[PDB]
Amino acid sequence: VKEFLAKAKEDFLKKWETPSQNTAQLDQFDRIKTLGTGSFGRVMLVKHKESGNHYAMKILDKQKVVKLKQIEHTLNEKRILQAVNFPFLVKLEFSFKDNSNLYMVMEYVAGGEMFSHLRRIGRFSEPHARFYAAQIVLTFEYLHSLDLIYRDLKPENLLIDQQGYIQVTDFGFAKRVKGRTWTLCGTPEYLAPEIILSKGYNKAVDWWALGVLIYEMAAGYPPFFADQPIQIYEKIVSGKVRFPSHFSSDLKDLLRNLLQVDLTKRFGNLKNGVNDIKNHKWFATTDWIAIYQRKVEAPFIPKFKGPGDTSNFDDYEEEEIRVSINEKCGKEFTEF
């Protein structure tokens, strides 16, 4: 399959080298409702006047970005997002900025975060969890082949589309790196031990995170948890994992290989790469090509009621979009 990835890389490189800029403007959209928030910045449901299409607009306050020292991270996010193209990755339609904010307009994925459905239902059956896992596996295979590291896998960053398929959003911590990196970033429950221990890490962290994800989906709770992050880190470092009695023998086997504290033994980081994962028994009944082609019938299809429907998202407190009369941090975000 190296053939496919090979030509996909040519596409990526072209856009990575010469990114698109300023492909729209704020007055072309009608701001409708906040779909979600994060460490900073919100995502709003917007409607494009000329086309009538609905999109999801991520808004970033330039000043907050600088305060939290996320300039480089924010620049990576946009540069990487506008260059990638994969069935399970959200599409960036437009990007632009003004005196105060940075804007990224993406396709609107109406199904809601996997998070909400997961918490509501409690947990997913293995066949259901496997369906989602396969899509992540292919996505990481694509991303890594481009020397990209995702670094923020979690149900909150995964969306369900109208067909019940996954759409990965939030490339806030995505980074193009050959070799190792050192930033302490991600989400506590999903941090790989090497990150916590500040040893310098690579793409292997994404595979560990997949382990945590699969576990959370099947169990209904993450493998390591507590009330304070520091308490969580201590458990992750220990590597001691307990499996619910309902977990299949194959699932447990796969998990012990992904949640492997030792990098030399962690699945995905070995000689056979992603194949150790794709060939594992738990995925025995998984038709990789069918998933890629989105020909598999989804085990769960979210209730959708026409375009613009946000019933699959929680409600958030709305707030004015402020645009100063003066340009803020112009130099810092020149390339954006």
Binding site: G38, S39, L68, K69, Q70, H73, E113, F115, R119, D152, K154, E156, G172, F173, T183, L184, C185, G186, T187, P188, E189, G220, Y221, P222, F225, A226, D227, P229, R242, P244
Partner: peptide
């Protein structure tokens, strides 16, 4: 049960990313 301990924990809602 583990489930009951999790549900009673302070981290059952949406988790924020970190950049320490």
């Amino acid at each position: 049960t583990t489930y009951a301990d999790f549900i009673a924990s302070g981290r059952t809602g949406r988790r924020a990313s970190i950049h320490d």
